[PDB]
Ligand binder design. Structure first.
Ligand SMILES: C[C@H](O)CCC[C@H](O)CCC/C=C/c1cc(O)cc(O)c1C(=O)O
Ligand SMILES: C[C@H](O)CCC[C@H](O)CCC/C=C/c1cc(O)cc(O)c1C(=O)O
Ligand SMILES: [K+]
Ligand SMILES: [K+]
Lengths: 269, 268
């Protein structure tokens, strides 16, 4: 059965977290919207293959909103990696496989490079490396204008599956609605320049598996494909766009399980 | 200022071709639909910058239909490259910059590798390397079915600009209508396995500039980005999808001119 609970870390964050299963640890880091209910179906499917799966809402977001302002303002990959290590310490997770999309992608690459003894392998999806002025400029609008604009962007531009996105349901969407202004004012100006992929040689030989959405327009994460290839990092596609865990939960779960299994084999070898 | 004419090559093809301008040669090879009126606006814009621009309908297609069946069946990159060299020979084009999309992309890479003395530099866009069973399977349908399926694919899925695609006009779409079954029966089963990108080391250091459409879904030409990166070939994006010369003719023309100028500087 699923643990659903809260835990406080010495940096002042009260996290909402979920955990299911027994076995090697897999940790699912949310994208910038910080909403771990997006993983619900996949958590059960991955845990059923013999893994302990942990996820959580991100600081300032959803049910992890009781957090100091520094944790959700001027956010960087390296700040988020420090926060994730804090909850892994609190939960006594010594060695983890990690997944992340978007700011979660930047976070898991920063985790693997910064805490190599802690991270078995990292899966990154759609890692943001470019400043986008039209998203950065939402930060000066009123809260309800930001929520209306970004709710529409998520559904129509990046969900990868409008029926699955809407089917997250009213409780989830009401939490996202409150998160959009927090994300807009804390993330888009500071996350892209923090991308831990400027040093291509630091990525070479690392246990990293990179994906982009099959349906994502080529221009969105073209740079990820180039960077991964230059570094000799395994690069491939998942169905859908920015939220494969929402649009295609069973394919997502299979990818996480298979990739974790590949690294468990290689680790013993 | 546009010459619109025909020329016969000793492989049996009577080509329809167009030429405009004076200067270094730039040759625009069509995609698999073989229809050079798609380049009309861009030909004038490129020639205006001091180039002689040549384009043509492809064998069996549109106004180059007077051709033997081998030129439009079981078509490979290597067959198409031989045909393009035959028209360049006939027009006394000794050195050319070449552009191609789709089967035209495979053609221009085959030209650059196979005929290096003839090719100043090649621009390839969206080069097909994978068999797609759903397109291969159109080859066994009736002609009217094939034309309806593929006309809809071009307009709604890969044009990169439906209004520009429709604005090609009734006469062009009537030619395309007849080309769809010829393309379906001769191209999709044989072009992808002939892709001249098996040897990444053969591409390294070559005067090749590769593009994908910015709006194309990542999966379609993901492998082009990986291959170009592995080879150290310049890889970038054009606006739109599979037909940048239709959807964004002025951006396309500027790209062709600037890329040609970059190689004219390097060659000196
Ligand atoms: C930024 C990438 O280079 C290309 C992204 C293209 C997508 O279609 C835009 C929609 C999802 C936005 C992600 C995003 C954007 C931004 O301006 C800053 C960010 O920090 C993020 C982030 O946290 O993901
Ligand atoms: C085929 C690519 O490998 C990857 C994605 C292709 C586009 O999205 C599909 C729409 C245009 C089709 C091109 C195409 C398809 C095919 O089955 C064989 C071909 O020879 C071609 C060709 O000559 O373009
Ligand atoms: K699925
Ligand atoms: K244009």
């Amino acid at each position: 059965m699923r643990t659903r609970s809260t835990i406080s870390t010495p940096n002042g964050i009260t996290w909402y977290y979920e955990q299911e299963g027994t076995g090697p640890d897999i940790v699912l880091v949310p994208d910038g919207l910080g909403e771990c209910q997006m993983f619900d179906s996949s958590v059960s499917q991955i845990a059923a293959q013999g893994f302990r799966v942990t996820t959580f809402d991100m600081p300032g977001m959803s049910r992890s909103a009781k957090a100091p302002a520094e944790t959700y303002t001027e956010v960087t990959a390296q700040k988020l990696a420090s926060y994730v290590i804090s909850i892994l310490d609190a939960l006594d997770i010594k060695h983890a496989t990690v997944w992340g999309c978007s700011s979660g992608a930047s976070t898991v690459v920063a985790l693997l490079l910064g805490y190599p003894d802690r991270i078995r392998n990292a899966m990154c999806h759609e890692l943001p490396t470019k400043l986008l002025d039209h998203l950065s400029n939402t930060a000066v609008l009123e809260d309800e204008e930001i929520s209306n604009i970004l709710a529409n962007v998520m559904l129509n531009d990046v969900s990868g599956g409008s029926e699955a996105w809407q089917a997250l349901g009213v409780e989830v969407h009401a939490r996202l609605h409150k998160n959009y202004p927090v994300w807009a004012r804390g993330y888009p100006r500071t996350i892209p320049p923090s991308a831990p992929v400027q040093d291509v040689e630091a990525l070479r030989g690392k246990p990293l598996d990179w994906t982009v959405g099959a349906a994502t327009p080529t221009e969105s994460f073209f740079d990820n494909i180039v960077t991964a290839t230059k570094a000799g990092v395994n690069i491939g596609l998942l169905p859908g766009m920015h939220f494969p865990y929402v649009s295609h939960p069973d394919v997502f779960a299979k990818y996480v399980v298979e990739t974790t299994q590949k690294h468990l084999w290689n680790s013993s070898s």
